[PDB]
Amino acid sequence: EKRTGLAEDGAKSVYERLKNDRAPYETRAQNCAQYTIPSLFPKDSDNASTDYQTPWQAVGARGLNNLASKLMLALFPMQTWMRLTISEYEAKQLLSDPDGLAKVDEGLSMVERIIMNYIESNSYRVTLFEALKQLVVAGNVLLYLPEPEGSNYNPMKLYRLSSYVVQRDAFGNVLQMVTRDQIAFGALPEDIRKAVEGQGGEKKADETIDVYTHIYLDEDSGEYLRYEEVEGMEVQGSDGTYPKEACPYIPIRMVRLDGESYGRSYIEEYLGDLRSLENLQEAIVKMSMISSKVIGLVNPAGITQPRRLTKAQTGDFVTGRPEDISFLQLEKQADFTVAKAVSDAIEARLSFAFMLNSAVQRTGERVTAEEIRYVASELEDTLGGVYSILSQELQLPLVRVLLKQLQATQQIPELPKEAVEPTISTGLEAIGRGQDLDKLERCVTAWAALAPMRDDPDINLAMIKLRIANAIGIDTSGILLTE
Amino acid sequence: ASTDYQTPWQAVGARGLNNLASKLMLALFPMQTWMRLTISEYEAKQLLSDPDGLAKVDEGLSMVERIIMNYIESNSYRVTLFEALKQLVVAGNVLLYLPEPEGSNYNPMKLYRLSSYVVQRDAFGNVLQMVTRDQIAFGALPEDIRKAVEGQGGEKKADETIDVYTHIYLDEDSGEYLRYEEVEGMEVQGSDGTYPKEACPYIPIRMVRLDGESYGRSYIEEYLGDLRSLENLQEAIVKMSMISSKVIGLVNPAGITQPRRLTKAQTGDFVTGRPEDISFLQLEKQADFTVAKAVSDAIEARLSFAFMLNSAVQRTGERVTAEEIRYVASELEDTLGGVYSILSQELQLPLVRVLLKQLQATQQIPELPKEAVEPTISTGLEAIGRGQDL
Amino acid sequence: PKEACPYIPIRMVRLDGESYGRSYIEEYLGDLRSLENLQEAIVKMSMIS
Amino acid sequence: DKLERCVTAWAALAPMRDDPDINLAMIKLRIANAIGIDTSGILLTE
């Protein structure tokens, strides 16, 4: 009845203590936002009628959205993107019965379809796109998917970097998290209203109430404990025990670093050439505006005078020489050409770096056939390890929390006891279900090349079909007859 | 911890490291089967007769290859291997360690970058000893280590960091490794280990080996200087650009025009002055700018043929698995020197070998004969596909 | 009921802790207005001709 | 595009119904299941 161990002083205390170590990542987030798209991460004061200004450069703004879109095209497509398989007891099972694992395939495809349906229904696509924009501009996002509590609408609560905190060790084991939702008293969950009301004093409807959610490692066991706190007291009937692997609070980092509790954004690594673009581009716009100020210089040594140019109607003769009036130009030409040259040469870097279109995806883009393969292969070509690190950090828990809670609610089908608790694959190993569409297509054409004779003498047919199939990426374990 | 890394002035390095790591992964750990399990020196008894006889052996070994591949896909070795390849290209040494599986639950592979381990060798390359220096919190320790630390004395906080050390050493008696753990100056009870010579779970990987030298030197080291000569030569240019982005209006004092009258005038206001009086300060490095840009380009060309940056090879409609892995590996041995083969001997042999030991020590052995229970392994271009050439 | 509210308030680009929405044109307003000025002049400078 | 290219990939499986040394029941499912097809009424079970 007293929280001990890591949660010794309540959630607000831990949150305010760890906010100091949160702060620099937030500063980086603000800077990256100021150079890319300013609204996407405000400052903590600069809210509510603050008029974000566009950056002088446009490559940042294009680049953040393009990179988030391509990450979403390769990480959460229309297709099945997870894979549910069986290990270390299938050696009992997969030895015999190539007709036996077909029931297991049907059961697991049923489970994959039901997870995908829960994805499409509850609008995880919208919140995941938002989370990817946060994960590219800033370094850290925190997703939380609640208990479903019915088949009604249950979206996923996002947490941008300002409103949560995470402490780690030098591994990357998450020791503790605290979130800092600010909800109105009127729209609270019902149990929390009574817990706040018990503290005392009547409340207005729109008076803001800050909750804090704390998740911590136990001093006793290897499982998480969660509680809520409002105003300095643990919320009654909001206790929680969570297993080690099915933690519903998922903290996501884009680029990890050793012995460091948070993540650093992908835009950070190319920030400087971003800001060097900014300056170099800024000037140009400013230097343009100087050109847009006509000043007529009249030469005092001459004759012509502007009480007579101006008052004359059009096509009126008037007295004067033409060498007297001139106009003030701005003769930066060599500076303008060198500034434009380095501006271009820096946008080229940021275009190969942010996947801006260098004639890859323009020429008649389609869906689902060769497309997701190409997108993911390019996203691992550039971007470093974003697509794989992101797949380990994001998709494993997003399948794992779903697979826990949904099958803890819905129906378990026919499939055996070694496939009730399955293993999950997520990345390029899990796109499609089979290895490669091009493999199966060219393998079928290579089989069609084996037209001429069934019982062709002086040759084999049973092994060479297996060999042409087994040279390309085919399983060859149900594709070919044994007996 | 809040140090704000700065981007380099050149961009060829950044593109190049990621491209090289990606192409190494495309040719070293693809979607396909990438190891090969075969039989030697007793198959001469067996392969003489029964061309229908080795088909059962083929089926058994393809079953074992599939089960190793499944354990690869499930436990996310792809993510940690990509990280390890980026470490192995930028720095010279990585240390992978795959633990005992202890069930079919999630077991990823613990990486160790160069700062946190150490390796002593002889002038062969026999690994004599390794020590790793994981820094784990007291709260998230394994259960046996918590009691070993607690026995040392004093209560501990939850987030108080505890440095373990893992030591692996050659025996003075036999030719097998011995491992132990240590916290705070005492060997951890119930953490003893004896490991066979070939199935060592701690795999130290070097990119480019050198004789009589215990560590590895990165591939970026060999082209570092032309990298840094790019850096400087490029740096200036950006700096020299910024000088151009400072408008200073020089007004000629000998003349008439004066800037209390240019500025206050609205647009299209006549005002007095001659045009030869105001000019603007340019930066007249033009021949220096053209020679600097020329040598910059000519040095990026080298680093592009050196880091496999796109010189119109992989752009024109890239596909998967058919002619692709062959082409990638053949080019990665064309350039890069011996990276693809040295890396295959150092990396893929132990990563198959440790798996093949521990998994088949846990899971089921099929029908196949006694000369194929303990097989031989092929890894590189000899093992891409199963057959020789599509 | 909570889910079938016939009054639907729509925001284009949402922000945290802020009751309204900010338009998509806002984010590119400035380069919009810098076009405006830079273009305005030109038309004015034409008319002098 | 998935259904169209999947139907053409099935049409590539012309030559023989009862073609020896090969399966047909699973490979149609696999070529369909590599691209974005539900495969849950598209293919016969029983």
Coordinates of C-alpha atoms in Angstrom, one line a residue, chain A residues 78-79 105-106 113 366-370 431-441 444 447-448 454 461-462 465 473-475 477-481, chain D residues 1-3 5 8-9 11-16 18-27 29-40 45-46:
Chain A
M78 CA -2.1 -2.2 -47.3
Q79 CA -0.8 -5.8 -47.2
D105 CA -1.2 -21.7 -41.9
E106 CA -4.9 -21.2 -42.1
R113 CA -6.2 -10.9 -40.8
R366 CA 1.7 1.8 -58.5
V367 CA 0.9 -0.2 -55.4
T368 CA 1.8 -3.6 -53.8
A369 CA 3.6 -5.4 -56.6
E370 CA 7.4 -4.8 -56.6
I431 CA 6.8 -8.4 -46.3
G432 CA 4.4 -10.5 -48.2
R433 CA 4.4 -14.0 -46.7
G434 CA 6.6 -15.8 -49.2
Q435 CA 10.1 -14.6 -49.8
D436 CA 9.9 -12.8 -53.2
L437 CA 7.2 -12.3 -55.8
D438 CA 9.8 -11.9 -58.5
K439 CA 11.2 -15.3 -57.4
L440 CA 7.9 -17.1 -57.8
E441 CA 7.1 -15.4 -61.1
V444 CA 7.1 -20.4 -62.7
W447 CA 9.3 -24.2 -65.0
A448 CA 7.3 -23.3 -68.2
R454 CA 7.4 -35.4 -69.4
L461 CA 12.9 -33.9 -64.1
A462 CA 12.3 -34.5 -60.4
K465 CA 12.8 -28.5 -61.0
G473 CA 14.6 -17.8 -53.1
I474 CA 11.9 -20.5 -52.8
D475 CA 11.2 -22.6 -49.7
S477 CA 9.1 -27.5 -48.9
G478 CA 5.5 -28.1 -50.2
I479 CA 6.2 -26.4 -53.5
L480 CA 7.6 -29.9 -54.6
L481 CA 6.1 -33.3 -54.1
Chain D
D1 CA -3.1 -4.0 -59.5
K2 CA -2.6 -6.9 -57.0
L3 CA -5.6 -8.8 -58.3
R5 CA -1.1 -9.2 -61.7
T8 CA -1.8 -13.0 -64.8
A9 CA 0.5 -14.9 -62.5
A11 CA -2.4 -17.6 -66.1
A12 CA 1.3 -18.2 -66.1
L13 CA 0.4 -21.6 -64.4
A14 CA -1.1 -22.8 -67.7
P15 CA 0.8 -25.9 -68.8
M16 CA -0.6 -28.9 -66.8
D18 CA -1.7 -32.9 -62.9
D19 CA 1.9 -31.9 -63.7
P20 CA 4.2 -34.5 -61.9
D21 CA 7.1 -33.6 -59.5
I22 CA 5.4 -30.4 -58.3
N23 CA 2.5 -29.0 -56.3
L24 CA -0.3 -26.7 -57.5
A25 CA -2.4 -26.2 -54.4
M26 CA 0.2 -24.3 -52.4
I27 CA 2.0 -22.4 -55.0
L29 CA -1.7 -19.6 -52.6
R30 CA 2.0 -18.5 -52.2
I31 CA 2.1 -16.4 -55.4
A32 CA -1.3 -14.9 -54.3
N33 CA -0.1 -14.5 -50.7
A34 CA 3.2 -12.7 -51.7
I35 CA 1.1 -9.8 -53.2
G36 CA -1.7 -8.2 -51.2
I37 CA -4.5 -10.8 -51.5
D38 CA -6.7 -11.9 -48.6
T39 CA -6.4 -15.6 -49.7
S40 CA -9.5 -16.4 -47.6
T45 CA -10.1 -25.3 -48.7
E46 CA -12.9 -28.0 -48.7

